[PDB]
Ligand binder design. Structure first.
Ligand SMILES: [Ca+2]
Length: 202
């Protein structure tokens, strides 16, 4: 047995602050025999969930000739928004691994991928304002009205901190168009858009 086990894991695992998550990976091997205790989910440097993502949990079972790796946890309300490279590293009974420590290191530095590699994305779960913002012209808000909109979005999303948005500044990170459509750009460059028509009226 020189054939390595193969992990099937989604390319992105997206989790939301203040919520639980649950995803699965699968492992197969020509031998159908595994070392479950040496099948882990980890960051590059050591067999650990990783700095900043200490809440990333996993558990492994065997179902027929495959492993199922449950990837789960509870995301703190104030963990950093952004993404991380993580790895499912599986071992077969013969000791073959899907990705070696050296391969993981090359992939990290070169920005290439190994089998079992996934991007862990921490997102904010945006909420549309509950209370309507009343404006004189819904197709052309005043600057005073756009600031009311920013305030409403901040009040409807109280766990969104200044350090969570672009440039760590609410004014740069939460931008309002002429019709009140609001883009929230997070510190990682990802964006959520709230269409003005869902909370703006005349
Ligand atoms: Ca094998």
């Amino acid at each position: 047995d020189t054939e390595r086990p193969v992990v099937n894991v989604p390319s992105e695992i997206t989790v939301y602050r203040g919520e639980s998550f649950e995803y699965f990976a699968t492992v197969t091997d020509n031998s159908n025999a595994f070392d479950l205790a040496k099948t882990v989910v980890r960051w590059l440097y050591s067999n650990q969930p990783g700095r900043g993502t200490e809440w990333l949990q996993y558990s492994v079972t065997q179902v027929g000739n495959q492993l199922k790796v449950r990837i789960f946890g509870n995301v703190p309300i104030d963990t950093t928004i952004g993404d991380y490279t993580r790895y499912v590293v599986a071992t077969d009974a013969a000791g073959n691994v899907n990705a070696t420590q050296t391969e993981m290191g090359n992939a990290a530095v070169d920005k290439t991928s190994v089998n079992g590699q996934f991007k862990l994305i921490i997102r904010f779960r945006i909420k549309t304002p509950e209370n309507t913002v009343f404006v004189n012209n819904p197709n052309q808000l005043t600057e005073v009205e756009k600031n009311l909109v920013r305030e409403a979005v901040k009040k409807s999303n109280p766990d969104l901190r200044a350090q969570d948005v672009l440039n760590s500044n609410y004014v740069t990170g939460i931008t309002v168009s002429n019709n009140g459509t609001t883009t929230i750009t997070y510190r990682d460059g990802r964006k959520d858009i709230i269409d003005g028509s869902k909370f703006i009226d005349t």
